[PDB]
Amino acid sequence: MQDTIFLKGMRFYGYHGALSAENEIGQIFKVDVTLKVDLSEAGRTDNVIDTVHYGEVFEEVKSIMEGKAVNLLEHLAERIANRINSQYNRVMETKVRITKENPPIPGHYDGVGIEIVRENK
Amino acid sequence: MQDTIFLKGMRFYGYHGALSAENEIGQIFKVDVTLKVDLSEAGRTDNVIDTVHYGEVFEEVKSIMEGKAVNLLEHLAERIANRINSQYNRVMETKVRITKENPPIPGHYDGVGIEIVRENK
Amino acid sequence: MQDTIFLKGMRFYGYHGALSAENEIGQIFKVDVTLKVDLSEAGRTDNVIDTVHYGEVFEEVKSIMEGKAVNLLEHLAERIANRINSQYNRVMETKVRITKENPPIPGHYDGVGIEIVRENK
Amino acid sequence: MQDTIFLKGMRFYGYHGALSAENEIGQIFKVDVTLKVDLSEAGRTDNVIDTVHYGEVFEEVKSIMEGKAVNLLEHLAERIANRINSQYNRVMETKVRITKENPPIPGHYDGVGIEIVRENK
Amino acid sequence: MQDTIFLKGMRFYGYHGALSAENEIGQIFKVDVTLKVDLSEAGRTDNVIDTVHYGEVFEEVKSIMEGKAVNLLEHLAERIANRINSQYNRVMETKVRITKENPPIPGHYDGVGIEIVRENK
Amino acid sequence: MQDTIFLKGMRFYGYHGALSAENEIGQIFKVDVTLKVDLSEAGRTDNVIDTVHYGEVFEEVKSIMEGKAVNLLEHLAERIANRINSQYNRVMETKVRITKENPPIPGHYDGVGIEIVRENK
Amino acid sequence: MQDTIFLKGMRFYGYHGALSAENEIGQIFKVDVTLKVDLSEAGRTDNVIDTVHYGEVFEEVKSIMEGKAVNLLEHLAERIANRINSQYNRVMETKVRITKENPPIPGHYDGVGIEIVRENK
Amino acid sequence: MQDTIFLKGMRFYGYHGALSAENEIGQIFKVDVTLKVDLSEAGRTDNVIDTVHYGEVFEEVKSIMEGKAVNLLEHLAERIANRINSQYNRVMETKVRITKENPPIPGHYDGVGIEIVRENK
Numbered sequence: 001m002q003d004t005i006f007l008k009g010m011r012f013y014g015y016h017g018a019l020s021a022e023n024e025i026g027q028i029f030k031v032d033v034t035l036k037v038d039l040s041e042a043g044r045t046d047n048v049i050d051t052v053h054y055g056e057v058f059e060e061v062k063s064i065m066e067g068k069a070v071n072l073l074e075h076l077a078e079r080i081a082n083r084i085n086s087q088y089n090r091v092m093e094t095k096v097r098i099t100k101e102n103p104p105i106p107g108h109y110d111g112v113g114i115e116i117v118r119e120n121k
Numbered sequence: 122m123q124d125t126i127f128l129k130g131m132r133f134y135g136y137h138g139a140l141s142a143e144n145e146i147g148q149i150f151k152v153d154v155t156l157k158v159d160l161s162e163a164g165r166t167d168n169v170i171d172t173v174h175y176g177e178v179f180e181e182v183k184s185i186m187e188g189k190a191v192n193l194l195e196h197l198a199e200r201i202a203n204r205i206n207s208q209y210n211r212v213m214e215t216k217v218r219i220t221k222e223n224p225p226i227p228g229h230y231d232g233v234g235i236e237i238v239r240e241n242k
Numbered sequence: 243m244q245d246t247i248f249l250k251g252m253r254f255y256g257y258h259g260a261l262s263a264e265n266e267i268g269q270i271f272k273v274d275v276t277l278k279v280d281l282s283e284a285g286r287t288d289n290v291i292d293t294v295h296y297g298e299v300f301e302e303v304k305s306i307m308e309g310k311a312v313n314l315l316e317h318l319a320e321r322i323a324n325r326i327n328s329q330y331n332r333v334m335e336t337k338v339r340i341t342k343e344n345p346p347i348p349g350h351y352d353g354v355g356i357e358i359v360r361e362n363k
Numbered sequence: 364m365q366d367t368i369f370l371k372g373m374r375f376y377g378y379h380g381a382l383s384a385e386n387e388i389g390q391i392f393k394v395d396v397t398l399k400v401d402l403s404e405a406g407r408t409d410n411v412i413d414t415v416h417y418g419e420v421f422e423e424v425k426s427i428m429e430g431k432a433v434n435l436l437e438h439l440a441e442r443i444a445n446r447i448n449s450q451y452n453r454v455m456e457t458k459v460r461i462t463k464e465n466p467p468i469p470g471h472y473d474g475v476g477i478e479i480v481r482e483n484k
Numbered sequence: 485m486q487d488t489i490f491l492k493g494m495r496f497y498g499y500h501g502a503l504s505a506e507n508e509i510g511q512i513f514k515v516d517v518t519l520k521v522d523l524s525e526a527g528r529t530d531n532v533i534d535t536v537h538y539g540e541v542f543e544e545v546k547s548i549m550e551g552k553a554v555n556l557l558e559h560l561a562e563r564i565a566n567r568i569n570s571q572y573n574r575v576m577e578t579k580v581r582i583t584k585e586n587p588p589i590p591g592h593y594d595g596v597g598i599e600i601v602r603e604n605k
Numbered sequence: 606m607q608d609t610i611f612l613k614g615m616r617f618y619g620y621h622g623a624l625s626a627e628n629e630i631g632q633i634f635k636v637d638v639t640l641k642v643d644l645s646e647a648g649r650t651d652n653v654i655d656t657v658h659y660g661e662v663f664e665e666v667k668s669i670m671e672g673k674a675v676n677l678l679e680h681l682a683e684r685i686a687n688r689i690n691s692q693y694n695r696v697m698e699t700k701v702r703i704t705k706e707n708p709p710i711p712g713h714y715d716g717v718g719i720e721i722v723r724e725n726k
Numbered sequence: 727m728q729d730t731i732f733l734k735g736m737r738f739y740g741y742h743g744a745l746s747a748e749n750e751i752g753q754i755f756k757v758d759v760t761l762k763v764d765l766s767e768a769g770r771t772d773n774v775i776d777t778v779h780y781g782e783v784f785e786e787v788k789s790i791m792e793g794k795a796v797n798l799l800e801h802l803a804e805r806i807a808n809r810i811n812s813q814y815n816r817v818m819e820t821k822v823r824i825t826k827e828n829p830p831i832p833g834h835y836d837g838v839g840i841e842i843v844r845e846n847k
Numbered sequence: 848m849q850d851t852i853f854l855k856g857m858r859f860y861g862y863h864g865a866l867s868a869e870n871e872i873g874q875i876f877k878v879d880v881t882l883k884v885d886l887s888e889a890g891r892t893d894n895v896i897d898t899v900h901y902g903e904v905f906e907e908v909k910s911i912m913e914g915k916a917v918n919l920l921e922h923l924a925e926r927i928a929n930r931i932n933s934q935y936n937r938v939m940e941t942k943v944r945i946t947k948e949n950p951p952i953p954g955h956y957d958g959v960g961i962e963i964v965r966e967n968k
């Protein structure tokens with residue numbers, strides 16, 4: 001099953017990071033969420049109730065990205081994956097990519113980050 | 122067989138969407154279509170008749186993207202995949218990606234969408 | 243005097259617009275603000291108190307872009323220009339550009355908008 | 364008076380061009396329209412009737428860009444400028460930029476074009 | 485073995501295409517070539533003689549893209565893949581992607597094309 | 606008179622430069638040419654003979670950018686401006702911008718260059 | 727005299743800024759430098775000695791952008807303008823633009839900055 | 848296990864290359880590093896000590912990209928992969944992509960390069 005629902009380049013201003021200075025000033029966090037979902041019924045029916053509403057997913061990611069500051073991106077992606085898998089049974093697996101395009105790293109790069117994939121149990 | 126014929130970033134202004142306001146105002150829908158097709162005969166012959174004409178594919182996608190407004194992107198991709206698989210036997214499988222770069226979602230993101238893959242029966 | 247302080251591509255999700263559907267769904271408004279300010283004293287001193295703090299300017303634009311929905315972009319730029327000119331005497335003139343990259347216009351374009359320039363009296 | 368109303372990167376598929384092959388196949392024409400208009404009343408009032416409606420302007424450009432094929436870009440910009448100046452008295456002057464990002468020129472470039480500025484008489 | 489040598493976004497102005505008007509006027513063809521090559525010896529030695537010289541590959545693609553006009557992109561990719569596989573034994577498999585970002589198709593899209601993968605026999 | 610004919614982002618691979626290593630290896634030179642030309646007659650007539658043919662201009666720039674290697678960008682822009690002003694009487698003034706996006710300068714920048722403006726005598 | 731020598735998008739990682747957290751972590755500073763210089767002799771002669779060497783200019787900007795941390799961007803641009811005007815008599819006037827694409831401002835924008843123009847006395 | 852830690856578009860100015868002129872002048876090398884690392888413990892704990900610190904990885908890549916000039920990109924990627932695998936046991940496999948967007952190749956392309964994948968033994 002290769003069907004997917006996606007949310008690309010979501011951007012939030014948060015204060016996560018292991019450095020005290022990071023939490024103080026904050027930065028923009030870029031988030032890409034890809035959900036494995038069989039979309040054939042919805043495609044057949046055209047009923048919004050037969051699929052996962054992207055809007056609601058964005059609200060979950062948002063609440064975690066703009067909520068309490070944590071240290072790791074790993075911790076933020078793990079809470080999002082877990083939160084999405086938990087509320088949606090139709091989501092067979094959730095992929096979360098977080099990117100810090102501007103971390104406190106002296107250098108020239110497009111960004112640094114992590115990506116996790118979590119199957120829904 | 123990893124050969125493919127593709128159409129990237131096709132953009133149409135349509136009125137699909139589950140919200141009444143969406144159907145009223147409309148928006149730009151971005152479409153990426155990838156077709157699995159063995160292209161060796163055409164490569165050998167160089168005869169357009171031994172492959173699938175991208176132009177005709179664009180006309181099919183267009184007619185569905187710029188036709189009657191539906192609710193789901195899932196419904197639009199399912200009609201395109203089905204329409205392409207139906208008229209072309211050389212297409213072993215069709216992948217359709219639809220993206221709403223500007224849905225009625227209060228936030229900063231690059232876009233939201235769905236992607237389906239349908240083998241030709 | 244060609245010195246300037248600038249804020250480019252500020253983006254806010256608002257509900258302005260003359261169409262009822264626009265106010266309901268909303269959209270992203272892009273804002274560019276350029277302030278005419280003699281920056282030589284600050285350049286000499288290096289004291290933040292001798293110039294206009296970009297951060298405070300962004301907060302003013304924000305409060306107007308994310309506040310009460312109005313009809314025109316002209317009305318929004320006029321309130322921003324007026325608000326910035328009012329609180330800052332060092333700003334000799336304010337330029338405000340607002341862009342609706344995705345208005346309810348059936349077509350392919352990068353965006354539509356207005357730009358105003360207002361001298362501080 | 365430095366106030367302006369703008370429409371950027373409008374794109375149309377037309378068949379203009381002095382070469383027979385051009386008219387046959389066609390291409391994408393990119394259009395940027397900038398109108399000189401005093402926007403202070405509209406900014407004060409917030410009434411759409413006190414300014415020029417971008418939407419209507421796009422419809423005029425469109426009708427000329429997607430209508431009868433002509434030879435020159437100069438001819439197309441002259442008809443647009445003239446058409447906009449004619450219907451709108453509030454437009455003190457009209458600037459039209461047309462770009463052929465892909466003309467029949469053997470080479471590597473971003474595009475070629477012309478730009479005209481026409482005051483409203 | 486996941487090692488690869490690549491050449492991205494190569495662009496040539498050619499006259500291929502099944503339409504007489506296309507051959508007359510011509511267009512820009514974008515080419516991406518990815519070669520499967522075990523790069524461990526070269527990585528160990530650092531001797532250019534233990535790998536495939538990207539420059540020579542570009543010259544082969546070029547000679548085919550800027551040579552005799554053909555009808556299909558399939559024919560052009562098949563000659564490139566075949567030409568590269570033929571001269572290089574270290575290339576276990578060749579992937580060729582050709583893109584016509586501006587074909588004679590009335591519409592708005594980023595491009596159309598084909599991609600082939602050919603193992604070296 | 607604010608009318609102009611333009612050619613943007615023309616790119617050529619040349620060997621100019623004051624460093625021996627530069628002339629040996631070469632690089633990509635980006636060229637932007639803007640010509641001051643009254644385009645009203647052409648706009649009225651639609652006759653290609655009443656304006657300057659962009660294509661011919663590109664051929665002149667090309668012949669100078671891809672010809673004998675010189676030291677300065679200043680020398681290359683001066684020959685182009687002079688060459689265009691010389692063959693076209695309708696060109697009241699010529700602006701030439703040359704950019705070396707990748708010169709032998711150890712650093713991170715988008716490019717370096719020069720721009721000259723030459724009135725036609 | 728409209729001739730200019732330019733250096734665009736120079737990027738340096740520095741620790742300037744009025745906030746203690748800024749100086750601690752640092753950020754990327756983008757710099758655009760435009761010099762007014764009559765380039766006709768150099769264009770005529772083609773001798774590097776008749777113009778200002780972009781490379782040397784980049785070294786001056788660099789030494790100031792990557793040196794001692796200051797509070798204002800105004801202070802950094804004033805030292806660069808002054809430093810360039812001081813060593814080059816051929817530079818009639820210097821324009822310096824500094825941009826903080828990622829300042830400690832909670833929001834979505836492309837960047838904030840200042841621009842100064844300083845004539846050489 | 849599909850979890851990954853990444854560093855994209857790292858850019859360094861180095862002097863590697865098999866051509867004497869290349870080593871003399873130098874160029875910008877773009878580097879993308881993707882590390883296979885199980886990120887579940889870190890996601891659970893949120894302790895930086897349970898994952899690989901991107902910053903330290905960037906310092907290793909940097910020291911190799913900005914150190915002694917070598918001939919091949921293959922040699923540079925092999926030293927980075929080996930260096931990262933060596934210091935981090937949590938990294939199950941390392942992928943290194945190096946790109947020379949501007950090599951001494953007469954032509955128009957986005958870049959050329961190599962990519963290697965090395966499992967940690």
Ligand SMILES: Nc1nc(=O)c2c([nH]1)NCC([C@H](O)[C@H](O)CO)=N2
Nearest residue numbers: 017018019071072073104899900901
């Ligand atoms: N892998 C990884 N994930 C993080 O979230 C992270 C990290 N590595 N290293 C340092 C860090 C810091 O607390 C701030 O970037 C320091 O300025 N955060």
Ligand SMILES: Nc1nc(=O)c2c([nH]1)NCC([C@H](O)[C@H](O)CO)=N2
Nearest residue numbers: 052053054138139140192193194225
């Ligand atoms: N997954 C998914 N597909 C849709 O087409 C869709 C959707 N989810 N959620 C809401 C929606 C709406 O009808 C409009 O976006 C509401 O403004 N359309």
Ligand SMILES: Nc1nc(=O)c2c([nH]1)NCC([C@H](O)[C@H](O)CO)=N2
Nearest residue numbers: 259260261313314315346415416417
């Ligand atoms: N010039 C101008 N400014 C606006 O703000 C504006 C406008 N023209 N025309 C229509 C409009 C509408 O209320 C919505 O775009 C309609 O969907 N808003």
Ligand SMILES: Nc1nc(=O)c2c([nH]1)NCC([C@H](O)[C@H](O)CO)=N2
Nearest residue numbers: 380381382434435436467657658659
């Ligand atoms: N300046 C200018 N404007 C044009 O519209 C134009 C032109 N110059 N030169 C040739 C041309 C042609 O008819 C087609 O580009 C030929 O393929 N059209």
Ligand SMILES: Nc1nc(=O)c2c([nH]1)NCC([C@H](O)[C@H](O)CO)=N2
Nearest residue numbers: 173174175501502503555556557588
């Ligand atoms: N699949 C595919 N490959 C081609 O090379 C091709 C094609 N389909 N369809 C039409 C065509 C034409 O000869 C020109 O695009 C017509 O203007 N060329």
Ligand SMILES: Nc1nc(=O)c2c([nH]1)NCC([C@H](O)[C@H](O)CO)=N2
Nearest residue numbers: 622623624676677678709778779780
């Ligand atoms: N202003 C200016 N124009 C040039 O063409 C130029 C220059 N300045 N400085 C050095 C240079 C060199 O010969 C090569 O860039 C050295 O690698 N060429």
Ligand SMILES: Nc1nc(=O)c2c([nH]1)NCC([C@H](O)[C@H](O)CO)=N2
Nearest residue numbers: 294295296743744745797798799830
């Ligand atoms: N106009 C202006 N220039 C600055 O350099 C500047 C500024 N305004 N405001 C605050 C600031 C700070 O020290 C840091 O951005 C605070 O995080 N620096």
Ligand SMILES: Nc1nc(=O)c2c([nH]1)NCC([C@H](O)[C@H](O)CO)=N2
Nearest residue numbers: 536537538864865866918919920951
């Ligand atoms: N595959 C491959 N890797 C390289 O590093 C390389 C290469 N091929 N070919 C030529 C080269 C050269 O030494 C310079 O590019 C020559 O200017 N370097």
